[PDB]
Design a protein around this ligand. Sequence first.
Ligand SMILES: Nc1ncnc2c1ncn2[C@@H]1O[C@H](CSCC[C@H](N)C(=O)O)[C@@H](O)[C@H]1O
Ligand SMILES: Nc1ncnc2c1ncn2[C@@H]1O[C@H](CSCC[C@H](N)C(=O)O)[C@@H](O)[C@H]1O
Ligand SMILES: Oc1ccc(CCNCc2ccc(O)c(O)c2)cc1
Ligand SMILES: [Mg+2]
Ligand SMILES: [Mg+2]
Lengths: 234, 234
Amino acid sequence: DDYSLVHKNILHSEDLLKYILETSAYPREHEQLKGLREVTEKHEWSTALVPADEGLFLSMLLKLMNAKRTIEIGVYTGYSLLTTALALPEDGKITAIDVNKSYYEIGLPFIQKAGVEHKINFIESEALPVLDQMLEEMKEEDLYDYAFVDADKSNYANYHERLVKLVRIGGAILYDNTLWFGSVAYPEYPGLHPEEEVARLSFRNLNTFLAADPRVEISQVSIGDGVTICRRLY
Amino acid sequence: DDYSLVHKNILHSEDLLKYILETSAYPREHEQLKGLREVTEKHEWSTALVPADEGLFLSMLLKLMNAKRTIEIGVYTGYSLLTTALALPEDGKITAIDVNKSYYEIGLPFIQKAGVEHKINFIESEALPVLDQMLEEMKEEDLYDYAFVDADKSNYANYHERLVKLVRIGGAILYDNTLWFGSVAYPEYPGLHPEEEVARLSFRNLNTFLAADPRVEISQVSIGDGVTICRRLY
Ligand SMILES: Nc1ncnc2c1ncn2[C@@H]1O[C@H](CSCC[C@H](N)C(=O)O)[C@@H](O)[C@H]1O
Ligand SMILES: Nc1ncnc2c1ncn2[C@@H]1O[C@H](CSCC[C@H](N)C(=O)O)[C@@H](O)[C@H]1O
Ligand SMILES: Oc1ccc(CCNCc2ccc(O)c(O)c2)cc1
Ligand SMILES: [Mg+2]
Ligand SMILES: [Mg+2]
């Protein structure tokens, strides 16, 4: 491993995190989500995997807002993507974007056996070109209800400017890792990989920008590695 | 000096929580919410106050699900109540319940100055008798969209049995403090005040029960002191 923060928790002990997962997450986790998580935990990049308790939170948000059309930026093996597909109705639709389809192929068998692959349109590409072509093509009747952003960390602010125009008014945009293992809380943080430090500063700037952005109402939630929920106002 | 958990938090550092509050919560806090909070912080029971980052999270949930009729169990000085009243549409209605209206009159001037007191029907009573009386008069078209539970901790299970019938299908029930300062993570916990130990054992039982309850979907969110979101399935 080259990164420095992968094992740091934002809760005060591993025992508390394990209590949550063992008591409230794992018993509610779909069988195909469990299988996808177990394979992914063996992968070299398992650090980026969305945790099980955050997954149930994302699923709860989708259902309470009755989302039907979503976009997912940053798929990896597809844990949050499968979570989103399982939450949506039978005729829901998802646009999933990732640069590395081979990651998606790892979790695709579990997605298929869950019987929800028909809801997914997977696009193997960088997100910004796809988002720009979406804005050139999108009609007002096609705007998304929900957007989950979990890709290139230093590019969140760029995704934001596109997504505030691609989600409906009252729709939700969620940014993953906005607390970045807790390292955002200080002006400086020693011992980090160079691109770990770029992400840290990018999130510090992003969090300040989102709090002042009048186009949205926000809520930063200390779940997982930190999730910031945005709701488009106009 | 009499209760043991009051100086504990579930995040790994006070600095991270301060970062969240200062970066994301306080800049989005209504001026009357800021006033109610700052007078409450000088009250003897200020430890029971719903924090600012959790308050914005409740506000986000209410708007994303388009809540109109809500019920609030456990008001205290009214921070979460005022948060709810400011999040609902102008025609929103709240049933607020608390055994001690003296606490409520600490925050009522801020609720009035915010211009939202017209949304609130306050009932000075124990919660259970009111909920039982609601079960006899409730009409199917009068079910609540949303319920925030934050009263006597040892009675949450009794509240749940009423609320899964008073909240509409697809409505939300939120239980505050379900992580109880992290103390629920161990079967035995040392040196608590007898009432803190009763609440701890009550939350351990409630968390296990809710995870197995087929009437609801759940998400335990490690925000504040832990909030368990329930969604009624039938
Ligand atoms: N510019 C870019 N455009 C689209 N995807 C990108 C990208 N840069 C990196 N990514 C992808 O973003 C992913 C981040 S890991 C995301 C984890 C996933 N949300 C889960 O539920 O586990 C990686 O798979 C990486 O391939
Ligand atoms: N049996 C009961 N029925 C109704 N309220 C009760 C109760 N037992 C205790 N309470 C009330 O529940 C409250 C818990 S403190 C609640 C904090 C409040 N939700 C906030 O936003 O800050 C106390 O005010 C207490 O008076
Ligand atoms: O009967 C009790 C139970 C617990 C205590 C100590 C904890 N203080 C209460 C508290 C703390 C945080 C909250 O969010 C809340 O609703 C309430 C004291 C008397
Ligand atoms: Mg992530
Ligand atoms: Mg509470």
